[PDB]
């Protein structure tokens, strides 16, 4: 399954502007779940809208989410200057979430106009490891009740996009792993130290990259809340 948005968009503040994210299938459909989420500069990921059509509490009104015409659209009334960013939606695909590539919204004109964090995720910004090695990534979850919520692990670098990684949920116990990283990866988490665990083994070049973890859970705002992404660099 291959999901398609538009590369850019361009738009100028007061505008409305709609991004569009559609499916290799030929239609988002309601289990799709689609989330929708925001990147702006040094990789700062926030979640827009989860379970296609929810705005996450906290969110400004100008952002709405629905499925319309076999696509996810996200729309926003009265685009503002802070609103240049990256804009990715995410599919459930039954047993994994696949990413779009990313709308580019440049917002050009006049700035000024426009309406105006409990949840924290804190990750280390950096780790370097050899190759043949294992690497531990941490998260530590605060300002909510940490095991009630699952966190997912996310992966990116220019040119391959964002990739899911898995999933932990320290309630159940369950973990569900991409096909790419079930071998590479393993997840765990420490109730205690309300900290989740991403383990990296056999390491090799292509492991340099940015490794995210964010918030989950089961019929709500999926990838509403981020961590910073540590930045692992694999040495020579
Ligand atoms: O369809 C609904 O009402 C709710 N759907 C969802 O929340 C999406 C979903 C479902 C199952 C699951 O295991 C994962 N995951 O991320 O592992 C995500």
């Known amino acids: 399954a291959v999901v398609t948005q538009e590369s850019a968009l361009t738009t100028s503040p007061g505008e409305t502007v709609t991004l569009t994210c559609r499916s290799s299938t030929g239609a988002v459909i309601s289990s799709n779940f689609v989330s929708w989420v925001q990147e702006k500069p040094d990789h700062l990921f926030t979640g827009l809208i989860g379970?296609?059509?929810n705005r996450a509490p906290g969110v400004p009104a100008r952002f709405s989410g629905s499925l319309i015409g076999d696509k996810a659209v996200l729309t926003i009334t009265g685009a503002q200057t802070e609103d240049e960013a990256i804009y990715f939606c995410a599919l459930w695909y039954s047993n994994h979430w696949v990413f779009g590539g990313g709308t580019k919204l440049t917002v050009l004109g006049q700035g000024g106009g426009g309406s105006g964090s409990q949840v924290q995720l804190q990750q280390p910004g950096a780790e370097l490891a050899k190759p043949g090695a294992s690497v531990q990534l941490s998260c530590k979850g605060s300002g909510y009740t940490f095991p009630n919520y699952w966190m997912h692990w996310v992966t990116q670098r220019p040119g391959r996009g964002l990739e899911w990684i898995g999933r932990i949920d320290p309630n159940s116990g369950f973990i569900r792993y991409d096909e790419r990283f079930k071998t590479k990866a393993t997840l765990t988490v420490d109730k205690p130290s309300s900290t989740a665990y991403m383990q990296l083994s056999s390491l090799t070049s292509d492991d340099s990259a940015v490794y995210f973890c964010?918030?989950?859970?089961?019929?709500?705002?999926?990838?509403?809340?981020w961590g910073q992404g540590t930045t692992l660099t694999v040495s020579s």
């Open positions: 964010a918030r989950g859970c089961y019929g709500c705002i999926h990838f509403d809340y």
């Open positions: 379970g296609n059509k």
